[PDB]
Amino acid sequence: VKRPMRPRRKTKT
Amino acid sequence: GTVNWSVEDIVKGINSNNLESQLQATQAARKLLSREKQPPIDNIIRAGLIPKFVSFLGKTDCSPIQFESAWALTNIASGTSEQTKAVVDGGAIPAFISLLASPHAHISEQAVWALGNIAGDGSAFRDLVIKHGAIDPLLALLAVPDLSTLACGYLRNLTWTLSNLCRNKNPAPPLDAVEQILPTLVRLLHHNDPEVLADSCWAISYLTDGPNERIEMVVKKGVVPQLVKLLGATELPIVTPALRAIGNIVTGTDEQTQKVIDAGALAVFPSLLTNPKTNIQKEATWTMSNITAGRQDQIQQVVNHGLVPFLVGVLSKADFKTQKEAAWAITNYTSGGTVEQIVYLVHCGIIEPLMNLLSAKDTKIIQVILDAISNIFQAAEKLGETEKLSIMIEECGGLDKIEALQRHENESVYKASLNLIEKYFS
């Protein structure tokens, strides 16, 4: 069988 | 002018009944919140200014105060989950969606950025931005014949925000929202900008991290060839999400895996399995382990491309986490391969580095290796050459390890180790 196993926020300056 | 104001002065100006005094104070608040060293986000929130900023978003006759407040709210929403929540609780979401259709491009771009920070908090806010109806106006900003006529930074923010709408699990984004976004997302995946490409691959990366129904939705749009092209890119920020999406796709059905093979993906793996970045090497090995778990004609395609020696090499020397993924690739290879394919694995030199890793201080890799040895011996029986293989394991010092693994804590390790020395005595 198979085995199942990029910034969320940006500030402007 | 508006540099280095106190919070008390900012409050005094915003609470005045003068729109231009309020504009001056909001700019001073934006400059405080855009400093590198500890922006006083919590202080601004406690002063009660978020509701005032939200109302300023709607003053169409004074676009400078729309922009300054959107910038200030963008940076508050970039902090902790409690700080993003304060922005949402103030009513910001519908106000930012209205600003998306502003005739001023710098204000519309700022609304895209703010909605990206809100949706990036997690599944709940992501779905709440979608329910407020953000997708239609977002995609309308990209409905041009050629994306190159848009400003570079405007296009990068739109791709990033969209990727945050594809992100996070438990739950995944709504199916209808994904189907509505994908055509634009695929167009962005063919654009020439490096940052647009990286964030588009991350979006495809997110959409393929789930059940086979999600994988098929992506594969149906025919993005697999373009993913393979980006898989061989020079830029590291593009290769990393490209490989993640390929590895996600090969967790699905054998037919979906075969589309990756047909696009020529295996030709890129000589480099990926020797990449100087530890993370690229591990993810490539993990992907190989899911490919050797497929059909025999797929294992054969792994053989034809010459990747078995590269698995021998990674097993010989790599970071220990990459080595374990290679041990999995071998056991999947041996359990589903033919006899001719299992002996070819021995002719390449798998036995010595496989034995040398039995000295590892990990129980799971021990079990995986031993089960692989069993499958290899079973194929030696079918040919009647078990004597040769047992001699081979002894000469390199593998028997000393197998027999030492008898006196092991884990019961399963002991039983398999004993069963091996009883059947073949090496």
Author numbering:
A (entry chain B): 41 to 45, 111 to 118
B (entry chain A): 72 to 497
Manuscript text:
SOX2 is essential for the neural development, and the self-renewal of undifferentiated embryonic and neural stem cells. SOX2 is one of the key factors required to convert somatic cells into induced pluripotent stem cells (PSCs), and in concert with Nanog and Oct4, plays a central role in embryonic stem cell maintenance. The localization of proteins to the nucleus via the classical import pathway is an active process and requires a cargo bearing an NLS to be recognized by importin-α (IMPα). Humans harbor seven IMPα isoforms (IMPα1–7), each containing an N-terminal IMPβ-binding domain (residues 1–70) and a C-terminal NLS-binding domain constructed from ten armadillo (ARM) repeats (residues 70–500).
To further probe the basis of isoform specificity, we solved the structures of SOX2 bound to both IMPα2 and IMPα5 (2.7 and 2.8 Å resolution respectively). Consistent with the cellular and in vitro binding data, we observed differences at the SOX2:IMPα isoform interfaces, with that from IMPα3 being more extensive. In comparison, the IMPα2:SOX2 interaction interface buried 1082 Å2 of surface area, and contained 4 salt bridges and 24 hydrogen bonds. Although the overall structures of the IMPα isoforms were very similar (RMSD between IMPα3 with IMPα2 and IMPα5 of 1.5 and 1.9 Å, respectively), we found that the ARM 7 domain is positioned differently in IMPα3 compared to IMPα2 and IMPα5. This region is where the SOX2 HMG domain interacts with IMPα3, but this interaction was not observed in the IMPα2 and IMPα5 crystals, where instead the HMG domain appeared to be disordered. The position adopted by the ARM 7 domain in both IMPα2 and IMPα5 would generate a steric clash with SOX2 that could impair its binding. Furthermore, Pro106 of SOX2, that induces a sharp bend adjacent to the SOX-HMG domain, would clash with the main chain of both IMPα2 and α5 ARM 7.
